[PDB]
Design a protein around this ligand. Sequence first.
Ligand SMILES: CCCCCCCCCCCCCCCCCC(=O)O[C@@H](COC(=O)CCCCCCCCCCCCCCC)COP(=O)(O)OCC[N+](C)(C)C
Ligand SMILES: CCCCCCCCCCCCCCCCCC(=O)O[C@@H](COC(=O)CCCCCCCCCCCCCCC)COP(=O)(O)OCC[N+](C)(C)C
Ligand SMILES: CCCCCCCCCCCCCCCCCCCC(=O)O[C@H](COC(=O)CCCCCCCCCCCCCC)COP(=O)(O)OCCN
Ligand SMILES: CCCCCCCCCCCCCCCCCCCC(=O)O[C@H](COC(=O)CCCCCCCCCCCCCC)COP(=O)(O)OCCN
Ligand SMILES: CCCCCCCCCCCCCCCCCCCC(=O)O[C@H](COC(=O)CCCCCCCCCCCCCC)COP(=O)(O)OCCN
Ligand SMILES: CCCCCCCCCCCCCCCCCCCC(=O)O[C@H](COC(=O)CCCCCCCCCCCCCC)COP(=O)(O)OCCN
Lengths: 77, 97, 155, 127, 111, 438, 536, 51
Amino acid sequence: NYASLKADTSMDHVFGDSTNKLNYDFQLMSSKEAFFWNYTLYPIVGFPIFLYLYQFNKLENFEAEIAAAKAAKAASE
Amino acid sequence: VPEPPYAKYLANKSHYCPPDFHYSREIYAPYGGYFNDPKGWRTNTAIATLVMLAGAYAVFCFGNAREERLRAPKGWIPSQLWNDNVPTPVDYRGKVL
Amino acid sequence: TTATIEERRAFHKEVLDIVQSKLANKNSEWARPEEPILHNLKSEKEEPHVYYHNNNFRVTRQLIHFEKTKIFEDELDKCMRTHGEAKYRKCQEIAKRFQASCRVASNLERGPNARKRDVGFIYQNNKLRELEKDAKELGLNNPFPPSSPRTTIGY
Amino acid sequence: AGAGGPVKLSPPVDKPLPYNYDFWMDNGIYPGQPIYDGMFGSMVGNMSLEYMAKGWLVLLPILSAPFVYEHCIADDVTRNPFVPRQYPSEVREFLALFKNGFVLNDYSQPDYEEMKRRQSGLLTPIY
Amino acid sequence: SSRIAGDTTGKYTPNIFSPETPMDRSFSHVPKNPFWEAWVFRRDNIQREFVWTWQTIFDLATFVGGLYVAMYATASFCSRQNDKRNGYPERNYYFSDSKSNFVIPDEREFY
Amino acid sequence: MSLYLFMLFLQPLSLSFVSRSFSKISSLMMSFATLWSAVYMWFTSNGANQTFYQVVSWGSDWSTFGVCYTSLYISLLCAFIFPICVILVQGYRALSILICIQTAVSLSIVSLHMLAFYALFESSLLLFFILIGRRKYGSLSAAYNISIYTFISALGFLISAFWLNWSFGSVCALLPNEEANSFVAFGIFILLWVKAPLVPFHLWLPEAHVYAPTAGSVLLAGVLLKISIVGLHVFFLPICASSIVKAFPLILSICLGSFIFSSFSTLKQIDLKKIVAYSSISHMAIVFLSSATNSGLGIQGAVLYCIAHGLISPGLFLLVGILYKNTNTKLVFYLRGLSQQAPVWWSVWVFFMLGNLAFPLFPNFIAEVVCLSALFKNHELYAYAFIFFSFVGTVYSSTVLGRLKGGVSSQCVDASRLDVISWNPLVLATVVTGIGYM
Amino acid sequence: MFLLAVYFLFFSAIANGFFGRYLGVRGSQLLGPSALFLALLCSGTIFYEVCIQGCSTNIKLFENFVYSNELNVSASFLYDPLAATMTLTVVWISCAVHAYQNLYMRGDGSQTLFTSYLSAFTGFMLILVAGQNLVMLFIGWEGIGVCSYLLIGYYGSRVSAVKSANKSLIVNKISDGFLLGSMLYLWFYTGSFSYCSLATFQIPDVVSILVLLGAIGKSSQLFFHVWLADAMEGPTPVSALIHAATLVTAGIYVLCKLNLHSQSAVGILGAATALMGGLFGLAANDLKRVIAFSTCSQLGYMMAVLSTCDDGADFAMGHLVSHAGFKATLFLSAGLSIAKENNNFLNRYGSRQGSPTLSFATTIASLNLLGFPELGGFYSKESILNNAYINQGVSIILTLATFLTAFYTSKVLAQLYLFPYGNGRQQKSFDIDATTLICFGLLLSEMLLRIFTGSSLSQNMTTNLPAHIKNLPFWVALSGALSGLATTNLFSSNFMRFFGNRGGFDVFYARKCSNVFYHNAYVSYTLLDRGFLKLY
Amino acid sequence: TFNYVIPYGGSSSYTINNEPVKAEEVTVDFSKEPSASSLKLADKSDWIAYT
Ligand SMILES: CCCCCCCCCCCCCCCCCC(=O)O[C@@H](COC(=O)CCCCCCCCCCCCCCC)COP(=O)(O)OCC[N+](C)(C)C
Ligand SMILES: CCCCCCCCCCCCCCCCCC(=O)O[C@@H](COC(=O)CCCCCCCCCCCCCCC)COP(=O)(O)OCC[N+](C)(C)C
Ligand SMILES: CCCCCCCCCCCCCCCCCCCC(=O)O[C@H](COC(=O)CCCCCCCCCCCCCC)COP(=O)(O)OCCN
Ligand SMILES: CCCCCCCCCCCCCCCCCCCC(=O)O[C@H](COC(=O)CCCCCCCCCCCCCC)COP(=O)(O)OCCN
Ligand SMILES: CCCCCCCCCCCCCCCCCCCC(=O)O[C@H](COC(=O)CCCCCCCCCCCCCC)COP(=O)(O)OCCN
Ligand SMILES: CCCCCCCCCCCCCCCCCCCC(=O)O[C@H](COC(=O)CCCCCCCCCCCCCC)COP(=O)(O)OCCN
């Protein structure tokens, strides 16, 4: 029925025993560390987004400043 | 364990097979067995070579039909022997050959 | 521009006459029209016969545009392969025409959300030209590059 | 002998399994491994991430020192003892078009300013 | 102790009374392990161990809702840029409060 | 068209008169004959007739049936994949249920009336409740999930159809109507949101696939998920475009979130059918978003990518069903050494997994290229977002393949002659579409 | 005629991998090498026609491979001067490796499947190189990626090998995602996928960054070099092909085909990669790993040279084609050494009676790696170093990289031949047949022909530099070689440990990136859909 | 539209408007208007009174 739970000890002398076990607790990253690393790596992934945002803001600000100077020049003149 | 009846239909261990290596002989794989060397391999290789050359002939016809040279070669090229659409060579100075 | 109900009903009647004229003679190219039904309707969906006919006309036009763009690309490739290192000078015109065909084909039916297709960077180049003109005349300093003579192989 | 070598079989599980046991990769041969080596368990060379970060902190200033001088401290006039390659006007005008060109740094040229602004071009397409 | 069940000739009969175990499709079935089965049961029924904690709320919000907020902001920015690019008037999107009725561009109009 | 509809009605009809021992053979012949009738419908569909290739009405608005580009592709796909379902299923009860389900689904695709679409599509509600909740190998929870989700979404769609029938006077697609109301737009949208598994209304699909039979899973993945795009192109976009353009940032939010979280949820799977089922959910989002752009590229790309999915995911589900027959297990951790033990099964499994990862010689590549091009036409960032997070699919696919590939195993579990006959058509269709005969 | 080579390689792949039962192990051992020999004749004809005689050809197999609305792409092959050179180099190396695998893989079960993988692997490289449009290049790119996945993980019963294959697959997936983004950008704003209409004089920076990010994947540069070292798990014939021509060179070929790169990024990344690869190869103790880190360093040189001058693309390609030869020789000789000694560690190698051909091939390939004067590698490397003097930061780092390269190359040579025997007193042997001799003869002929024919047109063109500047690389290489022979200590134990861990790029990924990845998976599944949204 | 080439739906001109026309000639309403008590309760001016 079920597979046997008894291990094979034929090759222990050749390749070492299985007594030594892992020290891992099999638990994940802490919530606080995860928040920092998500909110750091995900922006790095979305590097085009920030480039587009920067250039669009630059374009709009230059356009608005041109408009303001145009208003100043067209008011007096 | 007494080998099953179908073991007679299964083939032996090849010369290239290491004597210590054991594999299940019943498993079928399209690329071949664990060490192959079938009987009649020479005829199969000859047939494969014939198919390769026939397909090469067909591909050669197709490519020659679709090989477009729009700029003249600087010198004589081997394709002139088999394809007639090669523009007449013109050298670096500009003289036609 | 205002449409009274009387004019709307009159156009409806005239479109019925058009449909009757089309029905008289069989046509295997009925859904591949060469000319649209001209109208001044607010929404083309108001008159169903005009809607479907002009939709078929638009489809035919777009198919023609796609095949034309493929043609232009073929001559552009041939001209590139012929001249050699003189390609940038001699293929400027054909590339210009090919990119114009691409923009026509894409932009006519881009859709509600789709942006304009900037083949050759013409709209960006125009924006930079306007920005430079305004900055120079108003005494501002432009943080953007000046317009370029050529940005692609053609446009 | 490449084929037929003896192997050790990993013992069958005999205790309740942890929820995240999918982090362990075991094909049945004895030395099972984490899904990504270094995620947990023994560390190669007994070196932690802190050690590697400190080593990188030591290296980066020395590695970056050659690059920072030319890119930042140096200027086009003083980078090199010569001007960029001089070309005929027809060739130079075409070559100056390339944003990634090498004639954009010719400070002798009267179009130096426009060439430099071309070199520092747009980050993203405007349209 | 075993026998061949399948017959290519077509004369196949299932020997339910045979002393020898047939080599049927169950012959190759995987033996299975008790603890692996309980791990499978635990992992599927992980909703039993769900507990509302401030850490759980923090994780759910910061990753799921955070990604939704970031995607919505990016999409809104792209829509604004496209409206500036196309030359359209500012479009009346659902949660944007705009005093313009522009929604769908008129194909006939030149923008 | 008329021949196709007649054969669709003939298949359930034949079961009543067959000997109950000839049922499998008659059902297979009927399925192939329906496939041939679909080929005839394609033959009699002229591309000159640009709007609708064919329209037939049988005395009422409800009986109006027609084929367009999307309808024709989806109907040919279902008629192609049905025979494989027929051979996989044994018993008069199972044959009856599957034949009735296929008749209803295939009549839904060609329907041009929203109310008739609703009536035919939801007729297969109890049949899945019984099918997924079968005695020994079924789960009642999954059947409840799928039935309730479908009922609520379809009832919202029905309410919107009633409002349209009251206001316009008609609910047939062939009559041009436009509405700007958001309540009706949401009523039509919710069905698409649920039927095409889109987060957070995707929970029904996994439980259904795992606890459905292999023929049932093949049909569900192959064509029932595609019914969403028939509804979108036929019954939502023509009338509800203003609302999709108004809500496009929200639509992108939901679609890209579904893609990302479905990809991440796939990583936590230990069951092969669940892995394939979650891959399907991540794949649906690109289709939904590409269509929602309402552009020529988007519609074509979505229908193409639906065809690619309906050729790739049925193959994976079929291979997993074959492996489960051979091994009585679906846990990846139990299955090892499959490369050595099943070279022929492993080759096809790797081929189809490469197809699911959208490699160039597969139809998924062409379809994805077109869909990404449509997204790039809308905005660059839209395409960039989808392209990057596609790497998550590679991680879980590679982990599954690596776990299955090697190890120690004492069982020869390789497919028989019947199994190879079962997937040969899918492999041939995948190759033919991959070289560009989309 | 031009199509024939790809046909021969794909026929070898289909024949060996689908009908290998009929052909047999011997049948592969004939059909493979014979088909690649025929492909070598065809590639030689192509090289003479296109490169020497300046006659480019375009072959359109079929049109409308993808035809959706305006989006239109065709399956076409354009053999331009770059493509002919890469095709010749690739076919020459692949024919050599196919000759090599006849005896090396005889002790392996699936030799026919291995030959089939090798031949399809070469075929996809030639598809990438000869494509006329971006989509054909993407097809070849993904084909070589999948073939590398099926070749590195050939030993499925080893967890390390399959995990290495998964690593390669994932990293390459990220890289081609960036490339697909750049492809979409270029189609949108140029109107086509073909390289002819692809030309843009000014391109926005996003496209350049996407192209560079895609290229640094296969051409393993920094932050993307993790897979190359782990790629040692595969059989030796795989390592030779992947490191010599098929995988690593593809990024450089893409960067040279489309000159959309930015000078500032490429030079810094290349110089950093060269220095780091040399430093990593210093610590390594496997024979095979040192050669991979040297491959990384040479890739760094080639990437750096693009920033220097207009001829940088030509210089990079010349170093590419020169590097393929002696690197392939180094892997093949290392693999034979491992088979003869049953060992992978440099400590236990030593002087032992062997074949004169193999030792000479190892010596000459290592001399080309070092920079020994009047050799094919020497010219292609001095063309880079001398022309990089204008970029002061790049030049310094490349000169230190030359020192490190000389040091570990000489250390490997001394440990393999000059050092006393270090292995045990056991019967170990690998007798070499005439086929392996023909393989090494082919490599040696490539090396010798490289000297007479050259690598670039501007190889011997004067760089107007002072003599002490021009001959400096030789002195640095000589000093590195002399220090390597003495086996002196160059760095403290802390930095030696740091370099042995390859900079800890993988440990950072493990501890932060993978844990965040699986915590995102935990939040998505356990907390949300099987948690909050699951009924009792 | 029901085709893969041009976008689905349609567009209406914003410049062009259609004159309203009555649904019927004489309008008879059976829906009563809000009562004064409803308007009083709905009034939120004085928060105490509204509460
Ligand atoms: C268990 C399996 C065992 C059997 C194995 C079978 C082995 C299969 C052999 C592989 C076939 C490779 C051939 C690839 C070319 C695809 C063939 C093809 O598509 O036919 C073309 C004709 O083109 C050809 O014949 C190509 C010639 C093939 C031979 C050329 C040299 C062979 C080298 C292979 C390189 C091909 C790379 C192409 C990458 C896409 C149809 O022409 P059209 O009428 O224009 O069709 C319309 C186009 N579309 C399909 C997109 C709708
Ligand atoms: C471009 C036009 C010409 C196209 C020709 C393509 C070249 C050959 C294409 C043949 C079909 C490609 C898909 C084949 C099935 C995929 C599975 C496979 O390739 O290998 C199978 C089994 O292989 C086969 O039986 C069939 C392979 C025949 C030839 C395969 C050539 C390489 C495939 C080409 C890559 C496909 C490209 C897709 C992306 C462009 C599994 O191999 P492993 O996982 O490594 O395990 C094997 C056992 N061992 C552990 C010992 C290694
Ligand atoms: C030549 C071009 C550049 C090549 C690459 C250079 C990379 C330089 C980045 C490292 C230099 C700055 C490091 C930050 C300062 C930290 C110094 C102390 C480190 C420390 O205390 O915490 C560490 C945090 O990991 C960390 O420090 C991770 C920060 C790394 C930032 C991401 C940059 C990519 C790094 C990839 C290669 C670098 C590998 C080494 C970082 C170990 O954390 P712990 O495990 O003990 O935490 C406990 C688990 N609860
Ligand atoms: C209870 C549940 C919720 C609780 C937890 C929520 C915590 C999350 C909050 C932060 C989320 C990320 C930040 C996005 C929102 C920023 C604030 C919104 C306001 C806003 O739109 O500003 C824009 C943000 O930039 C942008 O356009 C977005 C930039 C950030 C996106 C990229 C970073 C992650 C990349 C990962 C991929 C995700 C996106 C994929 C497409 C720039 O202002 P404006 O110029 O646009 O003018 C618009 C006028 N306000
Ligand atoms: C003016 C009105 C103001 C608002 C008032 C709101 C009042 C509440 C309205 C809720 C209506 C939703 C009806 C669905 C109820 C959830 C299902 C019942 C839960 C349940 O225990 O059902 C079990 C299995 O169901 C399952 O397994 C199904 C799992 C959950 C189904 C998911 C719900 C469908 C999707 C929800 C949203 C869809 C889009 C919404 C627009 C079977 O129970 P039993 O048969 O054994 O009987 C034994 C009795 N304990
Ligand atoms: C919170 C995020 C939103 C979640 C939705 C995500 C994306 C779904 C988009 C689907 C696309 C078409 C659907 C049309 C609109 C649906 C929801 C759009 C967002 C929304 O709620 O806008 C509201 C208007 O819609 C409405 O007034 C009706 C909303 C829908 C009603 C909900 C249930 C209706 C069921 C009816 C059944 C069928 C009935 C048929 C008669 C309020 O926005 P606002 O314009 O007032 O701006 C005020 C801001 N300051």
